Copies of this chain bind each other. A is one copy, B any other.
């Protein structure tokens, strides 16, 4: 019984496990319950704090993955399998994980809290790309990651109802943040220094905690990787949530709110997942059925309204995108695209793809998009058309919403740092045409290249170390730059005036200005006016 692996938290005692990291051991406490299992009558309901337990709780293995749709697009393909559940599915899934250096930190260490992505319909804190041992061992960080309900279980809502109020998956996240405040000191973490970081829907989640008052006292800084609370897919109005929920109910034979929800609660979990995707209003990509809802509660107004009118002084934020945000979503629904060929498309296929990629666009807006993205020197060139299709999806869903958030936060007094991640992993299994896809900067931030057995190059290992440094320096001080390192160059804050951001790749930081400025003016200023 190694005393370093024995911790007492408010609920009782835990036993962690010593894990081996390339440069030394780390302590891991996996599968710690932070809420009462949200099963039976608790389905769709806000999470309740976990009741205390007797004895020593075994926290040596990852707990179950929240019930969710499983990808079958490319069966057995590492590219899609690396994101699939790697533990049993269960509605009993509200657990969190803590990695700490071994022996545990002598003095209070800044805490990083990871919130995974997966379109609000999938994901798990147990995936290998979210392994916190490297950041714990190399940077001496205390890293926490929690499971939160996704799909219908975490976001199906009948606004105004008592039994399915919406946003419970965000409340799962909040409860875990509350747990860190109350317990992290026992692991040597500093509850006075908590940094949230997440990617895609995880980044959007982080943004929603920034925009929801009760969450604000639970953290101090934030990192939003390729996702934002504002934008076309991260939220739905109360009316559209209600619509989707009642339509899903009908598809599974159900049934007044109470009765509808009571009947939904009797349905096996897989039945809900089976009809999840049938409620979207149009054929599309980068759109998800059950996501956070503007309820007038967790979200007092639309993210747009809240970022425009919020005061963000005393908040530091790191935001960024990867070089090809859209490619990944194309094989998932646009005729002509595949991971197995060059995906050279026709102009006809391009016009078709735009309707799918910008599903809420009127015919006129769609033509505006086509005309803005067509390269008039080579209007028929398949290579340009394929790349332009990717750019349209990535700009509309991630890049422009990120530029928008970055600008409003800076204007509203926040300290902001922005980046574009441009390195494609040597180990990437998707075709070259997809470039640096959505989600592929994560393995570098978590430091996986430091694992010899993974076969990353020596340069990639040096690169990962650089990133871990930027992220942990940011967690420690709200500034990603090295406090004792001259000869850099420096990563300057992003401002509405100069709009500076940096490129993250194998070469030294390079400062650029204007994040897709002309194109985002099109998405952020003109298309809306084409109301």
Q: Does A518 belong to the interface (CB within 8 Å)? A: yes
6 contacts between A and B (CB under 8 A): A364-B530, A371-B526, A376-B514, A376-B518, A377-B513, A377-B514
- Known A364-B529, A364-B530, A377-B499; judge A371-B513 contact (CB<8 A): no
Instruction: Kindly report how many copies of this chain are found in the complex they form together.
Output: 2
Which secondary structure characterizes the binding site on chain A? helix
Q: For residue A364, which residues in chain B have a CB less than 8 angstroms away from its CB?
A: 529-530
CB atoms of B526 and A376 under 8 A apart: no
- Known A364-B529, A529-B364; judge A374-B521 contact (CB<8 A): yes
Inter-chain CA distance A367–B499, complex, in Å, is 23
Interface residues on A, range: 10 to 19
Q: For residue A530, which residues in chain B have a CB less than 8 angstroms away from its CB?
A: 364
CB atoms of A521 and B377 under 8 A apart: no
Q: For residue A371, which residues in chain B have a CB less than 8 angstroms away from its CB?
A: 521-522, 525-526
Q: For residue A499, which residues in chain B have a CB less than 8 angstroms away from its CB?
A: 377
Inter-chain CA distance A518–B513, complex, in Å, is 22
Q: How far is the CB of A420 from chain B (nearest CB, A)?
A: 16
CB atoms of B377 and A526 under 8 A apart: no
CB-nearest residue of chain B to A519: B376
Inter-chain CA distance A368–B371, complex, in Å, is 13
Q: Does A517 belong to the interface (CB within 8 Å)? A: yes
B-facing mask of A92-107, CB < 8 A → 1, else 0?
A: 0000000000000000
Inter-chain CA distance A514–B375, complex, in Å, is 10
CB atoms of B374 and A526 under 8 A apart: no
CB-nearest residue of chain B to A403: B376
Kindly identify, within residues 509 to 531 of chain A, every residue whose CB is under 8 Å from any CB belonging to chain B: 513-514, 517-518, 520-522, 525-526, 529-530
CB atoms of A376 and B521 under 8 A apart: yes
Q: How far is the CB of A363 from chain B (nearest CB, A)?
A: 9
B-facing mask of A343-379, CB < 8 A → 1, else 0?
A: 0000000000000000000001001100100101100
Given A374-B521, A376-B517, A377-B513; 8 other pairs, CB 8 A cutoff: A367-B526, A371-B521, A371-B522, A371-B525, A376-B514, A376-B518, A377-B514, A377-B517
Kindly identify, within residues 372 to 414 of chain A, every residue whose CB is under 8 Å from any CB belonging to chain B: 374, 376-377
Rank and list the top 10 A-B pairs by shortest CB-CB distance, nearest first.
A376-B517, A377-B514, A376-B521, A371-B526, A377-B517, A371-B521, A371-B525, A376-B518, A367-B529, A377-B513
Q: How far is the CB of A305 from chain B (nearest CB, A)?
A: 22
Q: For residue A520, which residues in chain B have a CB less than 8 angstroms away from its CB?
A: 376
Inter-chain CA distance A520–B374, complex, in Å, is 12
Q: How far is the CB of A520 from chain B (nearest CB, A)?
A: 8
Inter-chain CA distance A520–B525, complex, in Å, is 21
Q: How far is the CB of A112 from chain B (nearest CB, A)?
A: 34
Inter-chain CA distance A514–B499, complex, in Å, is 30
